[PDB]
Amino acid sequence: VLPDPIHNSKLVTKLINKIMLDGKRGTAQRILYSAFDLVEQRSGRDALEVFEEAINNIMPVLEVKARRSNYQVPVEVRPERRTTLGLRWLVNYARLRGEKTMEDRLANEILDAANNTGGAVKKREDTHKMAEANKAFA
Amino acid sequence: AKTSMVAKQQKKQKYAVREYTRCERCGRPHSVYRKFKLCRICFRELAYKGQIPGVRKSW
Amino acid sequence: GQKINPIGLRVGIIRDWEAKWYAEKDFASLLHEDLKIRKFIDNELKEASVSHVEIERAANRINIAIHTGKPGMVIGKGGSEIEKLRNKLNALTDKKVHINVIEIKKVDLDARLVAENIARQLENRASFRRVQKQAITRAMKLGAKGIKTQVSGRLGGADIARAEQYSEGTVPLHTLRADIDYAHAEADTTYGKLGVKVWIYRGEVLPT
RNA sequence: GCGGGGUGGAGCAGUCAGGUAGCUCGUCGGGCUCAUAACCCGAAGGUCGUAGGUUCAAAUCCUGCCCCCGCAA
RNA sequence: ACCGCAAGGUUGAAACUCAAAGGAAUUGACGGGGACCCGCACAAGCGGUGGAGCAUGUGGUUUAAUUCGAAGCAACGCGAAGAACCUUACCAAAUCUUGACAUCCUUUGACAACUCUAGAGAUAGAGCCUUCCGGACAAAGUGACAGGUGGUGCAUGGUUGUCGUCAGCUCGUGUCGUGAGAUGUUGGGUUAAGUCCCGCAACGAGCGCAACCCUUAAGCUUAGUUGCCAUCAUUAAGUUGGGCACUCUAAGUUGACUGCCGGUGACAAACCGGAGGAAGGUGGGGAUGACGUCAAAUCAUCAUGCCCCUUAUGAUUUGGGCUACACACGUGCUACAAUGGACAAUACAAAGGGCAGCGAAACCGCGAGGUCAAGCAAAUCCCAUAAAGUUGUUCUCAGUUCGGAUUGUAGUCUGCAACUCGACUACAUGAAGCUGGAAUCGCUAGUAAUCGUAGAUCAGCAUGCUACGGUGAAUACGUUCC
RNA sequence: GGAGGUAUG
Ligand SMILES: [Mg+2]
Ligand SMILES: [Mg+2]
Ligand SMILES: [Mg+2]
Ligand SMILES: [Mg+2]
Ligand SMILES: [Mg+2]
Ligand SMILES: [Mg+2]
Ligand SMILES: [Mg+2]
Ligand SMILES: [Zn+2]
Numbered sequence: 015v016l017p018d019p020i021h022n023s024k025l026v027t028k029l030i031n032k033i034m035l036d037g038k039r040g041t042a043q044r045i046l047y048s049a050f051d052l053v054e055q056r057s058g059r060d061a062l063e064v065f066e067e068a069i070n071n072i073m074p075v076l077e078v079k080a081r082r083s084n085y086q087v088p089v090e091v092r093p094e095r096r097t098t099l100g101l102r103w104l105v106n107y108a109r110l111r112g113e114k115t116m117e118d119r120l121a122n123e124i125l126d127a128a129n130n131t132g133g134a135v136k137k138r139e140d141t142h143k144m145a146e147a148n149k150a151f152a
Numbered sequence: 153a154k155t156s157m158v159a160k161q162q163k164k165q166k167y168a169v170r171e172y173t174r175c176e177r178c179g180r181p182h183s184v185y186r187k188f189k190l191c192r193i194c195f196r197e198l199a200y201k202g203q204i205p206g207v208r209k210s211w
Numbered sequence: 212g213q214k215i216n217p218i219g220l221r222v223g224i225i226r227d228w229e230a231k232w233y234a235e236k237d238f239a240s241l242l243h244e245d246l247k248i249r250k251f252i253d254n255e256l257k258e259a260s261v262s263h264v265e266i267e268r269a270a271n272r273i274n275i276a277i278h279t280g281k282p283g284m285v286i287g288k289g290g291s292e293i294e295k296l297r298n299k300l301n302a303l304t305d306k307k308v309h310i311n312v313i314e315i316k317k318v319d320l321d322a323r324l325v326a327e328n329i330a331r332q333l334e335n336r337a338s339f340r341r342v343q344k345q346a347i348t349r350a351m352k353l354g355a356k357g358i359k360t361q362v363s364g365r366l367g368g369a370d371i372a373r374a375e376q377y378s379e380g381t382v383p384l385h386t387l388r389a390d391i392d393y394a395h396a397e398a399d400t401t402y403g404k405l406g407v408k409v410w411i412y413r414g415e416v417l418p419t
Numbered sequence: 420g421c422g423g424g425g426u427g428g429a430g431c432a433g434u435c436a437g438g439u440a441g442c443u444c445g446u447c448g449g450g451c452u453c454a455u456a457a458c459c460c461g462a463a464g465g466u467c468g469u470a471g472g473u474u475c476a477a478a479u480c481c482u483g484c485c486c487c488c489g490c491a492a
Numbered sequence: 493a494c495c496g497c498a499a500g501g502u503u504g505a506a507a508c509u510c511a512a513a514g515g516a517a518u519u520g521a522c523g524g525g526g527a528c529c530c531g532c533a534c535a536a537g538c539g540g541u542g543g544a545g546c547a548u549g550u551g552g553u554u555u556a557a558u559u560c561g562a563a564g565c566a567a568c569g570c571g572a573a574g575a576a577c578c579u580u581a582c583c584a585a586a587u588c589u590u591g592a593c594a595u596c597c598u599u600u601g602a603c604a605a606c607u608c609u610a611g612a613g614a615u616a617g618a619g620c621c622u623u624c625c626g627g628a629c630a631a632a633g634u635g636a637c638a639g640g641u642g643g644u645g646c647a648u649g650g651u652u653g654u655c656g657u658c659a660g661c662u663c664g665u666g667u668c669g670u671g672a673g674a675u676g677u678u679g680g681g682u683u684a685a686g687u688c689c690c691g692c693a694a695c696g697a698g699c700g701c702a703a704c705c706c707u708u709a710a711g712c713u714u715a716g717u718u719g720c721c722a723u724c725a726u727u728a729a730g731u732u733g734g735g736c737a738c739u740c741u742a743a744g745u746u747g748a749c750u751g752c753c754g755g756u757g758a759c760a761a762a763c764c765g766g767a768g769g770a771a772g773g774u775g776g777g778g779a780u781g782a783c784g785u786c787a788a789a790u791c792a793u794c795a796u797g798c799c800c801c802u803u804a805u806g807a808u809u810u811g812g813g814c815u816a817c818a819c820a821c822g823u824g825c826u827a828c829a830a831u832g833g834a835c836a837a838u839a840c841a842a843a844g845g846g847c848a849g850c851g852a853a854a855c856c857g858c859g860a861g862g863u864c865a866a867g868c869a870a871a872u873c874c875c876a877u878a879a880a881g882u883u884g885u886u887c888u889c890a891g892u893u894c895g896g897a898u899u900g901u902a903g904u905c906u907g908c909a910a911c912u913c914g915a916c917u918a919c920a921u922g923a924a925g926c927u928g929g930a931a932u933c934g935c936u937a938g939u940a941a942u943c944g945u946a947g948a949u950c951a952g953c954a955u956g957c958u959a960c961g962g963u964g965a966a967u968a969c970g971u972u973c974c
Numbered sequence: 975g976g977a978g979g980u981a982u983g
Contacts, residue, residue, distance in 0.1 A: 034831085034963095036941055036942035036943085036963080037964030037965065040963090114888070153592095153640070153806080153807080157579085158592095160592070161578090167907090170578040178793050179793085180793045183949080184949075186239070188238055189239050189242075193651080193794075198242075199219065199222070200218060203229055203245060205233065208224075209219065209779070210706075210779080211777085212653095212654090220779085223705095363650095369647095371787080372649090380698080382699075383699085385781090397649060397650085401797080404649045405649075449821095452564105459929100460930040461929075
């Protein structure tokens with residue numbers, strides 16, 4: 015695929031195509047751009063910088079596979095599934111960060127993740143917690 | 153009670169709204185195409201036999 | 212496994228519509244005309260070994276063309292029988308019709324003629340097995356690349372049904388080049404209704 | 420006549436000491452299944468035999484009555 | 493009877509009952525047996541159903557009838573691509589009995605249309621004067637006869653579904669085996685494929701796979717109207733003067749074949765990668781469904797054997813019913829809202845239909861729609877403004893300006909007439925519902941998801957069916973499990 | 975590459 019017009023990044027477009035509902039790329043585009051505007055408003059610095067820091071935080075490094083009773087055995091996450099899960103959890107836990115507008119939701123989610131807080135980081139550490147707990151089965 | 157009703161639809165009727173189409177060779181009301189005045193079955197029969205111009209099974 | 216009629220598969224590819232006329236609107240009359248002609252030829256068809264009729268229409272004329280292998284029985288000797296046909300047929304239609312008897316030699320190579328024959332044999336209460344055997348025998352002597360035959364119903368007066376078929380040669384249905392001539396007929400046997408299907412494939416040619 | 424009891428369909432707690440009627444099996448609907456059973460998810464089903472009083476509150480205490488079980492007679 | 497402390501051992505029948513029990517091997521099927529392979533089968537993902545209201549179909553009960561059929565996958569928005577009447581097969585009432593319909597004899601005859609009385613209507617009854625064009629229309633007596641959506645789909649033909657587009661099923665000759673049977677059709681390797689090669693008591697072939705077929709994707713030849721508008725002037729507007737360059741249309745052609753380069757590999761097939769090229773590894777999507785299984789479905793498309801009714805199980809009209817309603821199941825629609833609702837302006841499609849039908853404009857009506865009336869049998873005109881989208885403003889988290897069920901009133905169109913029982917509109921009201929338990933479905937790309945549009949049936953009625961385009965993903969680690 | 979022991983119908 016390609017990078018985005020305003021910022022020239024692959025991840026932004028890959029994230030638009032995951033926020034997008036029913037192929038409303040422009041709606042998703044609007045709300046993500048306004049979120050970058052609003053996270054430049056609050057916590058004044060570059061939207062890409064804060065965003066990339068956010069995904070560096072929440073993007074995990076381990077995973078589990080459920081097999082057999084049912085063991086759940088750890089495994090090293092692929093570097094593509096890394097960004098995949100990061101962006102997915104970012105969007106979803108934004109959507110359930112529960113306030114008025116999704117741009118505000120997203121802004122707060124990237125903000126909290128940038129400061130290593132937020133539901134996405136919670137899921138990350140849950141994942142690693144259950145992984146190391148199940149480390150015996152590797 | 154088919155052939156009676158065949159006669160019956162082939163007659164005029166006390167008002168035009170009562171007039172209904174059925175295939176002319178098989179007295180079948182449903183799935184009639186009023187261009188051909190044929191039902192779906194006899195359409196297949198005849199178009200397979202090659203007896204209906206234009207027609208060719210598609211794609 | 213519920214397979215289709217190959218003539219229906221091939222129409223518009225290697226063989227053409229037997230009806231060869233246009234009408235933007237009035238199929239609602241003209242197709243029923245075509246069928247009623249197709250039915251009225253019961254007269255000939257009962258004995259005259261007619262394979263198929265093609266039909267063409269114009270503003271003035273109808274031009275019909277009946278294929279057979281015993282054409283004498285439809286033209287009389289000089290024309291009495293065709294004129295007998297024109298009278299009643301044109302009375303039905305109410306339009307000037309000119310006909311054209313046309314000959315197909317080699318009558319034991321034509322699907323509907325084989326089917327007609329085996330049906331009348333089985334009404335005369337012969338044996339399905341010998342019938343299909345000798346049909347394919349004579350067809351292969353006439354030099355066809357493939358024949359297939361099938362009869363289905365209450366063979367031998369049996370209490371229940373069967374489907375028996377024979378073949379010799381190649382009958383490539385899924386090939387669309389192949390001009391395989393299929394025909395179905397029936398036989399109102401004293402026990403029930405035997406349904407006969409027959410298939411010939413007499414080498415490969417295109418209409419173009 | 421004397422003595423014990425009567426709580427959803429069955430069997431049992433709860434009555435002694437009054438405080439929102441509970442347990443197992445069952446019943447009904449839905450699931451799984453080729454179908455049935457098991458199993459999973461839900462829901463009904465109880466004026467606590469009845470009629471009176473006391474109490475803010477009665478299965479619970481008191482009264483009266485109709486049955487059930489033994490003994491007898 | 494004998495032995496044994498005993499448990500029990502040795503010896504050892506019959507009555508009666510069955511027509512088999514049995515052994516070795518062959519073919520298949522099965523396996524909670526094994527190896528390999530594949531598939532939206534899992535898995536990684538996206539969105540849903542089951543929760544609510546509504547539409548629809550089915551079961552069950554009722555009813556005079558709620559016609560008949562389909563009932564694990566493979567019945568259940570299925571027959572029905574159209575239940576107000578007809579359709580309609582069912583029920584009630586009323587009616588007919590060579591009959592509503594066909595073939596025959598004869599009287600005949602050309603015919604009747606169209607009025608009026610009565611009837612609910614079928615119907616009779618008066619007319620109206622219908623005219624041999626021997627065939628033809630029209631009746632009439634006639635017995636032969638018709639008629640049957642009546643039974644059997646386990647007597648059937650034909651048509652179809654499914655295992656399954658899975659890749660398998662067979663045969664001729666030869667050989668092995670007493671024989672059933674085997675080989676071939678197995679093995680190595682590969683392939684989407686019993687696809688190909690190699691080997692091998694097999695050699696070949698056929699039905700299947702594949703290609704020929706259609707569509708879509710690039711180009712070229714011809715042609716240039718109703719289609720196009722670079723060149724120029726013009727006009728609101730490619731419209732009109734002009735050009736057919738471009739697009740497009742549609743006939744012929746080219747194109748793609750592992751065809752070529754390298755590497756791998758038994759050097760073979762084949763695989764991996766590369767170039768070129770619009771496209772590359774059956775390009776994508778269809779059409780095409782082997783032998784046969786399910787005594788699968790259909791006797792209500794039709795045809796048909798046998799059976800049955802025939803002054804009635806046949807036939808005619810009117811009215812009812814197929815639309816019921818304590819409940820259960822399935823398929824879908826609308827939503828449970830801010831990625832949104834309302835209002836305003838503005839933009840880009842495709843595939844299709846159209847003659848007594850498509851109905852532009854103007855006008856009236858808030859709106860359903862109505863009057864007039866242009867063009868149009870099509871690349872002309874109409875259907876037909878596409879909607880989502882974008883730009884703004886507002887509403888600011890509420891059972892809400894969400895949702896739009898239900899009911900009340902008043903109206904519009906169709907029709908012989910919308911109570912049962914059509915759709916639609918305006919107003920009023922404003923229910924349930926804050927994303928659904930156990931379970932479970934679909935989908936691997938222009939797909940899923942979502943937004944509109946069109947058409948057959950059709951007077952009128954679509955949340956259904958079939959078809960079209962617009963926006964447009966997520967993921968596939970991989971085969972341990974179902 | 976083959977042999978031997980080591981829940982219902
Ligand atoms: Mg899954
Ligand atoms: Mg529901
Ligand atoms: Mg029914
Ligand atoms: Mg049945
Ligand atoms: Mg009626
Ligand atoms: Mg093929
Ligand atoms: Mg059956
Ligand atoms: Zn028909």
